[PDB]
Amino acid sequence: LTKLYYEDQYIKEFKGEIIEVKEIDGKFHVLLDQTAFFPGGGGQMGDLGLIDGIKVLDVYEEEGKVYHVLEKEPKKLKNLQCELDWERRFDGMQQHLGQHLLSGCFYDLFGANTCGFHLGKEISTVDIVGFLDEKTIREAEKEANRLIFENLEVKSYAPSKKELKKVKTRRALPKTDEEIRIVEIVGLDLNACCGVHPRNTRDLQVIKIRRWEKHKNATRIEYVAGNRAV
């Protein structure tokens, strides 16, 4: 069945048909024929919103199937108006690409590698290998914002096994039964990622580095992108 979030990440309203209903203590876990509700992936949180005016409280994936936890019992089940909480969606889209952008700027400018990231509701972090002084950190922040306004294309795709052999990456790709998705900041960076990203760097608006500290062999950098930064 259909996962719309990987086909067009900007779809915020869609038509759906409830294929299954399971009542699990108070809540109604539903399957849909097609969904734009992201369950979560690559560190990024899942969606909330409405299915037929009934609030979606949780979205998860189990055995390749996206399940929606509804607070009330579905009545009508065909041709339903389904809408994402777009503010939540887009916030997570911006923070994730924000991380990729910074990571790509740190490597492009200074050869500095990323070894971790965290996307939280309040703040997000990225870990860069080694000590970094304030000068280099602020230069990466500047360059990130420069490429936002340069508006680079961000391609999200699942390569065919033919075109997957011509994919050049700096980190080895996972061994999986699942399909490899690629997120590519055109001209800057190309990484395997299951996230849902904006289609350009301009969509980030602005990126601000808040503060940083040492974490073992790394510099843990706190950042905000988009509406969080203002």
Asked if 185 touches Zn ion (CB under 5 A), the answer is no
Is the Cβ of residue 98 or residue 195 nearer to Zn ion in the bound state?
195
Q: Which residues pair with 56 in a beta bridge?
A: 49, 70
Pairing of strands 2-3, 34-35: parallel
Query: Does the footprint of Zn ion cover residue 195 (CB under 5 A)?
Result: yes
Window of 12-20, 35-43, 72-80, 108-116 that interacts with Zn ion by CB under 5 A: 35-43
Closest CA to 158 of 178, 176, 179: 179
Nearer to Zn ion, 39 or 195 (CB): 195
**What sign does the CA torsion over 34, 39, 45, 51 have?**
positive
* Structure tokens given for 129: 């290998």
Binding segment for Zn ion (CB under 5 A), chosen from 47-55, 73-81, 162-170, 194-202, is: 194-202
d(C-alpha 40, C-alpha 5), whole Å: 11
| Cα–Cα distance for residue pair 206/201, rounded to 1 Å | 9
The residue with tokens 């680079």 is: 152
Decide whether 156 or 219 has the Cβ nearer to Zn ion.
156
CB closer to Zn ion out of 40 and 42: 42
193 binds Zn ion (CB under 5 A): yes
Q: Interaction with Zn ion in 75-134: which residues (CB under 5 A)?
A: none
Q: How far is the CB of 187 from Zn ion (least distance, A)?
A: 18
| Footprint of Zn ion (CB under 5 A) | 42, 193, 195
